[PDB]
Amino acid sequence: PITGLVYDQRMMLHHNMWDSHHPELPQRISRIFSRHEELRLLSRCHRIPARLATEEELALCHSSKHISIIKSSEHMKPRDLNRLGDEYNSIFISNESYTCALLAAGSCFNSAQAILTGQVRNAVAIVRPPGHHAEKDTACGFCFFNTAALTARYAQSITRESLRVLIVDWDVHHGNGTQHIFEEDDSVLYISLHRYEDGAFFPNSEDANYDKVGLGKGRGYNVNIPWNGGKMGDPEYMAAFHHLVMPIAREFAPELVLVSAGFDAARGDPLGGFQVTPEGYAHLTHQLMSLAAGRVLIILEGGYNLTSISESMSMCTSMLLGDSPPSLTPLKTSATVSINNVLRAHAPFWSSLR
C-alpha cells in the first residue's frame, strides 16, 4: 500500500513580525520535513502536490465575513496587521498568512482526494498555520481556517454528503472550532483528547468538558476526553484509546479518518506540559489504521518543540508506511476519573462501551 506525503515550503512565509521567536515558527514544518528525509521516510512516500484552497471551499465551513477579513490582510500595512491580529485571541498575521492558510487547507484537500480516489492508502500532511481552533466566523489560537473541518466537508463534497468521517484530535488543546462546526452533525464524529484543568487551560472554555456530547441529531457524535491534574503520557493515552476512542470509532465505522495531529502533548513541549513519547504516537497511529480500511490522513496542528514534533510525526509516518510498532504502568487516579466520566456520558449513545 502507498503512503502519501504533502509538504510545501511556501507555508513557511506566515510569520510573526513582532516576535520572531513566537512558538508557532515557520521552522516547525521544515524541521519535520528534514527529519523525514534523514530517516528515509520521505523517499518511501508518494509525493502529493500542495494547492491553494478556493474561497468556495472555505465556504464549506466559514462565513463570508470571516473569509473576507482574513483575505483582506494580504494587502495590509504592518500597523493594520498588528491591529487586526490583536482583535482575535492569540493570533498574529503577516501579508502571507492568508495564502499559507489556503495552502494548508488545499494540501489536505489534495491528500484526502488521493486517499478517497485510491491513489494512496493513507497520508501525512506537514502543514501550517494550524486549524482546529478556528471557528466558522473567527480566527483563534494561531489558526485562521479549520483545515481538518474543511477537509471533512471537502471529502464529503467529492464523495457523498453522508460519508462518515472520524476526526481524532490528539493535539493537547481542545479543537473548539471542530467541535462547534460539527456539533449538530451526525456524519462527522469528533473525538478530542485535551488538557482541561477544569476549564482553565487554553482555549479556556467549558465547551471542552466531557459532558458536551453534541446537540440535536449530533448528540453522541462529539466525544471530549478532558485531562485534569496530571502530566499525562503514553499510559493515559493508550487507556483512553482502549476504553473510548477505538470502541466508539468501531461502532461509528468511519469511511475516512482525519487526525488533527498536534504534537504539543509530546514530552519536551512547554505549551502542553505532557509526556507522550514518539513511540506513543506510533501506537495511536497504528490503532487508527485499523479503521476505515486504513484511510487515515494525519494533519499537523500544534506542537512546538522542534525536535519532539519532528521525531513524533516521523514515527506516525513510519506506522502509516507499515513499519512494526515500536516497543512501549497503571494510570493516575485522575486519568481514571476522566475516562470514567466520558464513559458515563457516552454510554447512552455507544452500546459497545463497557
Ligand SMILES: O=C(NO)c1coc(-c2ccc(Br)cc2)n1
Ligand atoms: O497549540 C495550540 N493549539 O493547539 C495553541 C494555540 O494557542 C495556544 C496558546 C496561546 C497563548 C498561550 Br499564553 C498559550 C497557548 N496554544
Ligand SMILES: [K+]
Ligand atoms: K485535542
Ligand SMILES: [K+]
Ligand atoms: K459531531
Ligand SMILES: [Zn+2]
Ligand atoms: Zn495545541
